[PDB]
Amino acid sequence: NYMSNLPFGLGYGDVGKNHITEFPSIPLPINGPITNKERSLAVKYINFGKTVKDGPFYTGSMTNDGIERYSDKYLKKRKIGISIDDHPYNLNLFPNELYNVMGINKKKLLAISKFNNADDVFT
Amino acid sequence: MKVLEERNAFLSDYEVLKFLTDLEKKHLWDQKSLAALKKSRSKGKQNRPYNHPELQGITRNVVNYLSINKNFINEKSGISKMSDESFAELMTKLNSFKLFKAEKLQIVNQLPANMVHLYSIVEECDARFDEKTIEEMLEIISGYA
Amino acid sequence: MFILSKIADLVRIPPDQFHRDTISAITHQLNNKFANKIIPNVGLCITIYDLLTVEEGQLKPGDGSSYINVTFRAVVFKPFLGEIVTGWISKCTAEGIKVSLLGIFDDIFIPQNMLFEGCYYTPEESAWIWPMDEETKLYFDVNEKIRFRIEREVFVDVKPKSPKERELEERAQLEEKPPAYALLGSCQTDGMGLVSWWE
Amino acid sequence: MKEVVVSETPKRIKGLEFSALSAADIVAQSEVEVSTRDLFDLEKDRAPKANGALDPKMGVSSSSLECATCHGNLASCHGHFGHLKLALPVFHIGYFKATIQILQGICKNCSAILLSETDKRQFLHELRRPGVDNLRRMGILKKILDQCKKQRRCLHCGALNGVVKKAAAGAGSAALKIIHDTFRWVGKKSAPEKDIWVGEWKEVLAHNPELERYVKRCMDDLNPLKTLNLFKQIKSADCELLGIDATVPSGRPETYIWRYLPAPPVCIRPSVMMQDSPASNEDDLTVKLTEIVWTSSLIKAGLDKGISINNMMEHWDYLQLTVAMYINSDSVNPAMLPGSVKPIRGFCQRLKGKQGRFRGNLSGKRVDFSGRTVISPDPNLSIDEVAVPDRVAKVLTYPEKVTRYNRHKLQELIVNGPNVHPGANYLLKRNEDARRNLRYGDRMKLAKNLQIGDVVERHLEDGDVVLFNRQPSLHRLSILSHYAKIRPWRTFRLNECVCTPYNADFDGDEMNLHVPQTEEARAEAINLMGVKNNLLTPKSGEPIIAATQDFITGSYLISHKDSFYDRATLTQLLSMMS
Amino acid sequence: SEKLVTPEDVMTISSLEQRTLNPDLFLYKELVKAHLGERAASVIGMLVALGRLSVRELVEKIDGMDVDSVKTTLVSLTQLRCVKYLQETAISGKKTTYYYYNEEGIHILLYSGLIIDEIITQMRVNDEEEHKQLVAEIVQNVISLGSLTVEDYLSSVTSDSMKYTISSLFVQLCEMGYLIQISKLHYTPIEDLWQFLYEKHYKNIPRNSPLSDLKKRSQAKMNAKTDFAKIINKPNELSQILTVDPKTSLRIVKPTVSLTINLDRFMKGRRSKQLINLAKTRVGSVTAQVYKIALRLTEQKSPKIRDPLTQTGLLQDLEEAKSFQDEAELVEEKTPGLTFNAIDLARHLPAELDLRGSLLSRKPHSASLINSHLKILASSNFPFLNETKPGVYYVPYSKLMPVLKSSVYEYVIASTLGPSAMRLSRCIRDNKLVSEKIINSTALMKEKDIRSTLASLIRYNSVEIQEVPRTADRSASRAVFLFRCKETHSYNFMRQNLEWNMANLLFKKEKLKQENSTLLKKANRDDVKGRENELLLPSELNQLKMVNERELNVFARLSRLLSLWEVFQM
Amino acid sequence: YKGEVLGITRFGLSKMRDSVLQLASFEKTTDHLFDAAFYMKKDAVEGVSECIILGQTMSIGTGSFKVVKGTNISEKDLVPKRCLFESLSNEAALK
Amino acid sequence: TEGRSRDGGLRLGEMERDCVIAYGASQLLLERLMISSDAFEVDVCDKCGLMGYSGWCTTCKSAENIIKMTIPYAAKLLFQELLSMNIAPRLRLEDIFQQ
Amino acid sequence: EKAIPKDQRATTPYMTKYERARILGTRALQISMNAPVFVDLEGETDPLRIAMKELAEKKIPLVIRRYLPDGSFEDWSVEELIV
DNA sequence: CAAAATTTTCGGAAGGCATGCTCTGTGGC
DNA sequence: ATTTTTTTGCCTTCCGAAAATTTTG
RNA sequence: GCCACAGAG
Ligand SMILES: [Mg+2]
Ligand SMILES: [Zn+2]
Ligand SMILES: [Zn+2]
Ligand SMILES: [Zn+2]
């Protein structure tokens, strides 16, 4: 019958369900409360991520209407972005086939972000 | 269904009204055409109008919206009275001033007669134009070509 | 307010429509598909203006109707940002006022964030009151000719729900949806409002 | 107003992308988890029990229930999948040889492929040529596997790699076990792994000497849990050399090991109707699914309460054998199971053979609007005609669409009705979805209200195009297309000049008659398979439809040299042929 | 969730879709997508999935990206040292550049704040605020820009005294090994470098040699090995600091060199920290301080975490493996800067440390007490120190790192699966191959507890079943099952598990930020910053507080995993 | 035509034909389908047997060409209509 | 069904199928083997290539990519059987008209 | 861009049997869906015979698009094809 | 020179397939 | 818990065993 | 419904 014999340890009322949970129940001990040193380390992570995200090397994801009004005048431009080809590249560190997308002989400025000792994170 | 370009051209309300009146005359949808053939007499010819109800409804709503008077004042819109050469001469009068394409489009659509409405359509009206030019443009627009 | 959209489409002309002129049949099919309907992220289409290019009619194996690739210009109602327009007040609620352009489009809503300052709504007579001056007896009466300015256009997706959710929803309904195209009017400058007030 | 423009585009099938479902793909398409051995609950008049192998959420097997997922009957339900989580992973019997090959090509200690970087790059370059077909791909993969077999020690670690093979190569449980002999190429000396092995066995024989005779056969087993854990850290850059595309999430080796079993919809494993008992017999797949549920529940309970390891391994092997029988019944012996005989109809048995899906339901299948009757001669018919009995012609119908050229004809056919042969059996209106039987209506209001887009299923009449077939279809002339004639004598009749392509004689032959139901099929049959257009066989170009016996003899006797006819006999003969 | 959970809820609230991803690919793609854009994430993902790829292959394998976009994102990845490259010419004469992925840049992105904190701590500039802030900002700029020149960095600074202090801090970073000179070595692969050197020194040997083929191979690989060692040890020789006295006689790094962060020195510091934490649980607290001082003194000249010669595929010979072991054991001992005495440690102890009463002999930074601490370090059960001669000590890394790995792994098991799991694992590891009865006799607890605990341990590759068949067919009932503990499988599985956990945490954080992007963009403005309580709604303020707290907890848990994951990288 | 003598048999068809559904419908269905699943090969539906199995028009015989209805619209009938506002508008006087 | 006792249909086997192929009759083959035997309108997802119901894809949990097609029911049964065997026959769709 | 011009057509100018069958089937399907005919039908009702009559004196509005194996196609008017 | 590792060749066994194509009946579980 | 078979041929893949060849000492 | 034989060309 294939559904009659049981091992010695098991009982008849314990089998027949097969409810295997999908959610884990064994946590690592890393889930404790945060400390001051860990909070400074975390805000260092956050500041570094913000610095890289707004830096010249981002390569983002893969209402500017055509009508012209008088309000288009006296309107500020958003932000003059530093592009990929506006960095002082050391050309010895790159293959030759990537030269044409860089700036070989154009204006170069090195964008520097100053570290903020104060915690930008609000609580 | 692919949109090659979202905005190909700008249509004045006069162009839309003229095109839809021509469409209603072609498809026998005007009030005169439906009252003459389909009403007050038998349809011996059986010259049925265009069957399409949705297009008829939307074109009737647009022709009624553009046919009733523009609300420059509290019974005709004026665009229903204009012609091609009148449109051309009025618009060429409008290029002579310091107006943009959108501002000229709104002027042609609504035909402002109120002073404050003409203030509302064009931005920085007092700074860009002195009182003489605003009076002249109000007289030109209110004159209906 | 009205612009021209250039759209490429595939139209199926049934073989019983072969007696008509081909332009007339293509325009009829396009009017069936597009007239008085929301072109997504474009606006509301009224009527196809004209046809620019038509390809050869290709035929599917197992059907006699001719499929034609057609490029056409269509008149679409899309008020650009900043354009003012005159409507008729249909209903006023707590959150704002609802105005319709006489049947063509009944989905224009003006909220409190961009109406006249200090205005209040009276549920007893269903009207809004503007305290402009000592002569403050001015009312946003319904069925009245208001003038407003378009400040923002919103598109939503027409994404359907799960079939079980749809079935239980219609079962409960037997026992309101966000429109795909809407505009936000405003009153922030003299020249807005009722037509008679600035007579 | 408020409606959105909808656009539908006619689409055909461009290709198929065969793959294996991952755990996420199995659960994502699932609707309910099978977590009960009980098919029905006895307290609710034998209703399909929730969370069982016959849960309604997977569909319905009877015409009286509802799906409760799409809320449709048996006719309009497409069936839905369930899923079943196993307590322990088991080997897929279909991918078992692939599992052997992918274990032979990786290090059994760090899951790295046993290849040098130069050989790896050269093989990847060979695999990526534009003109590579399946044969060259399998050749390159076999070369890669051989070069991996010839590697004695790993490159990323100093671990020793031997030979990976089946345990016994039979038909029982041992046929589904993987064994790795690490010291098969150990040679003579200098093997630290051998020193560790002999240290382990010296330690363990200090307490149990009786295992000394079994040390020789002891080799590194690869249970499905350890095999899965070894597959999990296989680098994706090495998956292309094993034949797996790693650019998709489901292209991983660990996909080919059973962790989640997709429970099929009950619409493809329906419960058979009763024969002599109030109970209903279930399909073998449902019974095997319940057995898998029970075995997995037993394994989980044993793991959670601590049964003996021998019993746990025995039940693991039982679960593996049960899943193997669920996929392929003839792969393993049913006698190895404790319960067990007719071998069950597994999933592989449903696909192979002349009665399988491919040869019995896909390449060829039973069709509608067909008839079979004994054939008898009729020389008065033209060679492009077949005589159909009026009894058959009143059943085999052709759906004619009402046009402006045939409205009155179909009105008359509707008036005549299903009983008079020039009539019709069904009418389908333009705006309706279900055809109305024409033997119950007024048959005069329907004829008068016949619109110009209806479909009326008229009787097979004279001039209809039919396909005429004799079943030993050796060549293409064994099926032809004839114009129909209607005769009252209950047999198919064809001209005897046409029985030669059919290889037919009127000694009891039965032939088949198909009626194409579309205009395109009718025109293609009458223009490509007509008797007039197929007078010559394509084998040699010689005529195949010509004078047969008793027509050659009469023609010879007419054309004999001593045959002289007067004008009366001449004229009678001339009128006799026309 | 006592009630039934639909597969809808399983798919949408659990991480089932993330359990089918390779942990390395998942972690690298998540890190690159978090720091750089989605195009760089796609390129890195394809490089991990398909191995090495040309620019044309990357174009034809990624949909929607043309050659210009691929080249631009390759430049962006190459600047941050996230992509290695190798330019090779075929026999036909065509030249192709194949781009790899290198774990160095991705680990730099993963360890960034830990690196900054390590730089702040390891040069004792915590007392001075100006020096600490300057060091933090220069390290952050170096990591964010990948590699930079001192002249270009100082072109944005106008104060002469500030420029002098920045140059002095750059020199201080360079002399202690944390900033090195970037070169084509850091972009060329190790395997390709060793293959090129071996081929060059094999073709250098002339024809018709009297020596055989194995001797030719051994000579060529020995010459390639010494050339490879000389090439790898190049950036550690301080050749970029030799420019001394241009004016007023000070030492400055050259203004035409490109400095970059040194990952190996940081991992050496992390190894020292891990060893200090291990020693804190065996020998006291003052002894732990002495061990910390000794390890920080001999940290820069300690052997590397992973010897690159082991990553060249050369371990396929047993002789090469034992030669690597012998060379590591010799270089851990006979390096001139590794040995130390009590007098050497006496010059670096802090003022607060006393050592006076820490020792009881029987039941002022003195050299005898320091020697007693070093003796009890060297006499402990764990090999913290070894004595080449009486009074001199060195750290035996090659014999201490396996002990550290075993202790960390065992305590992870003890903390997760319970102390009984640790007892069972250590019992199985003590005597190598055992049966259930021998386990029950040696480890005194109940047999069903043994069976349940080992069944739990089996799922994580901690315990491997050895099947001994007693029949012709290997039936499970007739066979007998012994248990053995395999170290390599367990360490690999735990490393992959922690890597997947880090990747899942980063994915959760990125999803939370994406779903609160509107509020986060509103809050992250110059005017709003410092005025959050005024220009924001109370609900928006509460949501911002909750999001920031969740992000902080995520990054702290990531740091705690990194403290637990790098041990298996050793 | 493949450089060697294959032979009209299941082993010959396994090398001559790269399709999956054609080989599965002939002989050894299970092995071919599981091999296709494991090696993740893409079966282009161009063969006759695949078109029969999936129910679509085969590419030989009456399916080797496409029937096209010649539309009678001339080019003169497709000239653009009068767009008056965008044609009469000039912005010479701002700028 | 099979047999005249069950009002069954006559089998158009492999040999008859191949004879119809030899004539080049594509539409007749399509009518005999799909239209008159087991035609079935089914919903297939354009993204994941799987097979949905009621204009809804149970895998992507969305109705955006659903395309209605007509296939023999034996093909649908085969696809579900293969999916039950951990084989995923993901259909790939292309437009009939070149555009 | 794949269209071969009318002057450079290389395929045979004789209408094959498969083209005849497909043309007849398509025209009969069109006529069965109430399409206008261009012949003086003498009481014929079946669409197939009307299609044959239309092909008899070449009064049928269809063209044949022949695909070469490379991808370029070739348009032949049915009245142009010789039968 | 001959001991030891690697590779090739050679068997016997283990698998698989074929053992037409359609069609009509009954009898027992 | 003694103990028959009940077609015939063809084909590839696997897998030790032995032979052939090269490679280390 | 599954097997089992029995026949027809
Ligand atoms: Mg006979
Ligand atoms: Zn259903
Ligand atoms: Zn390895
Ligand atoms: Zn989908």
Report the CATH number that the domain containing residue D450 is assigned in CATH: 3.30.1490.180
Closest H-chain CA to F61: H18
D79/D76 Cα distance (integer angstroms): 9
- Cβ of D541 less than 7 A from strand K: no
- Which DSSP helix (H) or strand (E) runs through C10? strand C2-13
Q: Kindly give the pairing relationship between strand C66-77 and strand C2-13.
A: antiparallel
Query: One-letter amino acid identity for H40?
Result: D
Breaks (C-N over 2.5 A) in chain D follow: 340
State both tokens at E374: 């070093």
State both tokens at C171: 């079962």
DSSP state at residue D363? S
Residues in CB range of B85: below 8 A, 6 or more apart: none
Q: For residues D330 and D364, state if they share a domain.
A: no
Within 300-329 of E, beta carbons closer than 8 Å to A belong to none
Residues making up the annotated binding site of D for Mg(2+) are 505, 507, 509
Q: What would the DSSP string read from start to end of E299-331? A: STTSPPSS-GGGGTTGGGSHHHHHHHHHHHHHH
Q: Which residues surround ligand 1, an ion (CB under 5 A)?
A: D 505, 507
Of C77, C100, C130, the domain-final residue: C77
By C-alpha distance, which of H41, H68, H66 is closest to H52?
H41
DSSP state at residue A65? -
Domains of chain H: 1-83 (3.90.940.10)
Q: For residues C57 and C112, state if they share a domain.
A: no
By C-alpha distance, which of E260, E237, E263, E241 is closest to E167?
E241
H/E/C letters for each residue in D212-244?
HHHCCCCCEEECHHHHHHHHHCCCHHHCCCCCC
Task: List beta partners, residue F42.
Answer: D17
Q: For residues D306 and D319, state if they share a domain.
A: yes
**D549 burial class (0-12, 13-18, 19+ CB within 10 angstroms)?**
exposed
B139/B143 Cα distance (integer angstroms): 6
Q: Kindly give the pairing relationship between strand C145-149 and strand C84-92.
A: antiparallel
Nearest beta carbon to residue A112 from set E116, E141, E557: E141
CA distances from H80 to D356, H15, H60, H62, H64 (A): 49, 9, 11, 11, 10
Residues in CB range of C114: below 8 A, 6 or more apart: C151, C184, C186, C187, C188
Contacts 24+ apart (CB under 8 A), B22-30: B23/B59, B23/C47, B24/B59, B24/B60, B24/B63, B27/B56, B29/B56, B29/B59, B29/B60
Tell if the CB–CB gap between G89 and D16 is shorter than 8 Å: yes
Whether B59 contacts B30, CB under 8 Å: no
Of C44, C61, C77, the domain-final residue: C77
- Measured between CB atoms, does F78 come within 8 Å of chain C? yes
Tell if the CB–CB gap between E448 and D28 is shorter than 8 Å: no
State both tokens at E343: 């007098």
Task: List beta partners, residue D82.
Answer: D263
Of C32, C60, C77, the domain-final residue: C77
Helix (H, G, I), strand (E, B) or coil at E283: coil
Helix (H, G, I), strand (E, B) or coil at E46: helix
CA D555 – ligand 1 centroid, Å = 25
DSSP state at residue D471? S
Helix (H, G, I), strand (E, B) or coil at E43: helix
Whether E495 contacts E569, CB under 8 Å: yes
Method by which the coordinates were obtained: cryo-EM
Residues making up the annotated binding site of G for Zn(2+) are 45, 48, 57, 60
Q: Closest nt to D472 (CA→C1')? A: I21
H/E/C letters for each residue in chain B?
CEEEEEEEEEECHHHHHHHHHHHHHHCCCCHHHHHHCCCCCCCCCCCCCCCCHHHHHHHHHHHHHHHECCCCCCCECCCCCCCHHHHHHHHHHHHCCCCCHHHHHHHHHHCCCCHHHHHHHCCCHHHHCCHHHHHHHHHHHHCCC
Q: For residues D402 and D363, state if they share a domain.
A: no
Q: For residues D177 and D97, state if they share a domain.
A: yes
Q: For residues C180 and C146, state if they share a domain.
A: yes
Q: For residues C65 and C88, state if they share a domain.
A: no
- Cβ of D169 less than 7 A from strand J: yes
Q: For residues C114 and C162, state if they share a domain.
A: yes
D248/E25 Cα distance (integer angstroms): 12
Whether E181 contacts E235, CB under 8 Å: yes
Task: List beta partners, residue C139.
Answer: C129
Q: For residues C44 and C88, state if they share a domain.
A: no
Whether C6 contacts C60, CB under 8 Å: no
Whether D65 contacts D280, CB under 8 Å: no
Phi, psi of F72 (to 5 degrees): -100, 20
CB contacts, 8 Å: D309 with chain E: 436, 451, 454-455, 465, 481
DSSP state at residue C139? B
E44/E51 Cα distance (integer angstroms): 10
- Which DSSP helix (H) or strand (E) runs through E136? helix E129-145
CB contacts, 8 Å: H59 with chain C: none
CA E308 – ligand 4 centroid, Å = 46
Those chains having 3 or more beta-carbon pairs within 8 angstroms of chain G are: C, D, F, H
Tell if the CB–CB gap between G26 and C69 is shorter than 8 Å: no
Query: Where do we find the tokens 């089996």?
Result: E458
Distance D90 CA to J5 C1' (A): 39
Q: For residues D403 and D427, state if they share a domain.
A: yes
Q: For residues D210 and D61, state if they share a domain.
A: no
- Structural domain harbouring D477: 355-396+459-542
By C-alpha distance, which of B109, B60, B121, B71 is closest to C144?
B71
- Structural domain harbouring C120: 83-197
Whether D512 contacts D471, CB under 8 Å: yes
Q: For residues D283 and D207, state if they share a domain.
A: no
Query: Where do we find the tokens 């070149």?
Result: G98
D538/H17 Cα distance (integer angstroms): 15
Side-chain-side CA neighbours of D308 within 13 Å: the count stands at 15
DSSP state at residue F67? E
Whether F73 contacts D133, CB under 8 Å: no
Whether A28 contacts E415, CB under 8 Å: yes
Q: For residues C133 and C163, state if they share a domain.
A: yes
Phi, psi of C181 (to 5 degrees): -135, 125
DSSP state at residue A106? S
CB contacts, 8 Å: A64 with chain B: none
- Measured between CB atoms, does G20 come within 8 Å of chain D? yes
Q: For residues C92 and C41, state if they share a domain.
A: no
D327/D346 Cα distance (integer angstroms): 6
E498/E504 Cα distance (integer angstroms): 10
- Which DSSP helix (H) or strand (E) runs through C39? strand C37-39
Q: For residues C50 and C71, state if they share a domain.
A: yes
What is the domain-level CATH number for residue C173? 2.40.50.140
Q: For residues D443 and D503, state if they share a domain.
A: no
Q: For residues D193 and D312, state if they share a domain.
A: no
- Cα dihedral D223, D225, D226, D227, rounded to 10, equals 80
D201/D212 Cα distance (integer angstroms): 9
Residue nearest to nucleotide J15 (CA to C1'): D165
By C-alpha distance, which of C160, C163, C159, C156 is closest to C179?
C156
By C-alpha distance, which of C39, C42, C15, C9 is closest to C27?
C9
Q: Kindly give the pairing relationship between strand F65-69 and strand G11-12.
A: unpaired
Side-chain-side CA neighbours of E328 within 13 Å: the count stands at 20
Mutation pick from A19, A87, A115 vs chain E, by most beta carbons of E within 10 Å, is A115
From the CA of D505, which ligand is nearest?
Answer: 1
Side-chain-side CA neighbours of E233 within 13 Å: the count stands at 12
Q: For residues D254 and D380, state if they share a domain.
A: no
- Cβ of F11 less than 7 A from strand J: yes
CB atoms within 10 A of CB D414: 23
DSSP state at residue E208? S
Q: Give how far the C-alpha of residue D564 lies from the chain's centroid of Cα atoms, to the nearest Å.
A: 68
- Measured between CB atoms, does F29 come within 8 Å of chain D? yes
A60/E73 Cα distance (integer angstroms): 9
| Number of domains observed in the structure of chain C | 2
E565/E492 Cα distance (integer angstroms): 11
Q: For residues D419 and D313, state if they share a domain.
A: no
Q: Where are the alpha helices (DSSP H) in D33-154?
A: 96-104, 117-127, 134-149
State both tokens at H39: 């012949």
Q: For residues C89 and C65, state if they share a domain.
A: no
Residues in CB range of D286: below 8 A, 6 or more apart: D39, D53, D54, D266, D269, D271
Phi, psi of D117 (to 5 degrees): -65, -35
Q: Closest nt to F7 (CA→C1')? A: J11
From the CA of D73, which ligand is nearest?
Answer: 2
Residue nearest to nucleotide K1 (CA to C1'): D272
E262/D207 Cα distance (integer angstroms): 54
Q: For residues C73 and C90, state if they share a domain.
A: no
H/E/C letters for each residue in G48-88?
CCCEEECCEECCCCECCCEEEEEEEHHHHHHHHHHHHCCCE
Whether C119 contacts C130, CB under 8 Å: yes
Q: For residues D214 and D123, state if they share a domain.
A: yes
Q: For residues C65 and C92, state if they share a domain.
A: no
D377/D418 Cα distance (integer angstroms): 29
Q: For residues C129 and C48, state if they share a domain.
A: no
Task: List beta partners, residue C2.
Answer: B11, C77
Tell if the CB–CB gap between G63 and C159 is shorter than 8 Å: yes
By C-alpha distance, which of E66, G42, G94, B95 is closest to F92?
B95
H/E/C letters for each residue in C51-73?
EEEECCEEECCCCCCEEEEEEEE
Q: Positive or negative, the Cα torsion across C100, C104, C105, C110?
A: negative
Whether E452 contacts D303, CB under 8 Å: yes
Which residues bind near strand I, taking a CB cut-off of 7 Å? D 150, 152, 169-171, 175, 185, 187-189, 275, 330-331, 352-354, 364, 366, 372, 471-472, 474, 510; F 10, 27-28; G 2-5, 8, 10-11, 13-15
D302/E476 Cα distance (integer angstroms): 15
Angle E252-E254-E259 from CA coordinates, rounded to 5°:
105
